[PDB]
Design a protein around this ligand. Structure first.
Ligand code: O58
Length: 236
């Protein structure tokens, strides 16, 4: 996250750090807890990933440095990628991880609700991107989960910013006209979380964008409400 501030323990308890262990252990992507055995993440995250056997899901982490040889983690039983996924920029950048066991929800690991049936109308004015990514292009993965408030922009404005890409209704765009705050390298797969009526909804998944927090170039996020039937199909 560029222009972001450190978060506190328990603040974004649906957030996960997904690690690879091949050829060495490191943060791969962010993720959101949506069910006791279910993580929602980005499809492009598994580009180099031979099978679910090398993946670890770490819940309840503020700082990446807490993850020791004995920090418990969740195994991944399955990686379900949307069947129309090709590259992130052309959409369908959505995947589910089935954990090998159920999450017991605590103050440090909770589910985030999907956008509600009946709220397709809603204008979300309180949206936040979280993660452990670079604070600029060319940087490193950050130790403390970061947070940053970012405004949604219309799909019409976003298309005018990316005239070389097809910006469709299954994408949602977020960023400041001036730049400054946005997701960056290492934040993909994580949530764009919006509070509506004091309930937090998983409105987008960090996907792609041109540069990190440049002016007139919003972040592009998988539009979660357009995939709720796909998620429910796969998670029932
Ligand atoms: O190895 C390391 O140093 C740590 C390390 C760990 C993860 C990553 N991740 C990435 O490069 C992934 C795309 C990607 C994910 C997984 C596999 C391949 C590509 N991209 C992102 O996370 C941010 C994408 C992104 C999303 C949004 Cl909404 C806006 C801007 C951007 N960026 C534009 N230029 N850079 N970022 C980078 C470095």
């Amino acid at each position: 996250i560029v222009g972001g501030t450190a978060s506190v323990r328990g603040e974004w308890p649906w957030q996960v750090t997904l690690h690879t262990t091949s050829p060495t252990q490191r943060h791969l992507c962010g993720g959101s807890i949506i069910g006791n055995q279910w993580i929602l993440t980005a499809a492009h995250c598994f580009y180099g990933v031979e099978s679910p056997k090398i993946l670890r899901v770490y819940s309840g982490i503020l700082n990446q440095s807490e993850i020791k040889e004995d920090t418990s983690f969740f195994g991944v039983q399955e990686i379900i990628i949307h069947d129309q996924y090709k590259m992130a920029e052309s959409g369908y950048d959505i995947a589910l991880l089935k954990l090998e066991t159920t999450v017991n929800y605590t103050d440090s690991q909770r589910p985030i609700s999907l956008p509600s049936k009946g709220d397709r109308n809603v204008i979300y004015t309180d949206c936040w991107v979280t993660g452990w990514g670079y604070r600029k292009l060319r940087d490193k993965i950050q130790n403390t989960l970061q947070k940053a408030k970012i405004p949604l922009v219309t799909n019409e404005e976003c298309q005018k910013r990316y005239r070389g890409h097809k910006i469709t209704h299954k994408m949602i765009c977020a960023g400041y006209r001036e730049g400054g705050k946005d997701a960056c390298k290492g934040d993909s797969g994580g949530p764009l979380s919006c509070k509506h009526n004091e309930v937090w909804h998983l409105v987008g998944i960090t996907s792609w964008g041109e540069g990190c927090a440049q002016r007139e170039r919003p972040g592009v996020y998988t539009n979660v409400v357009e995939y709720v039937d796909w998620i429910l199909e796969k998670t029932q």
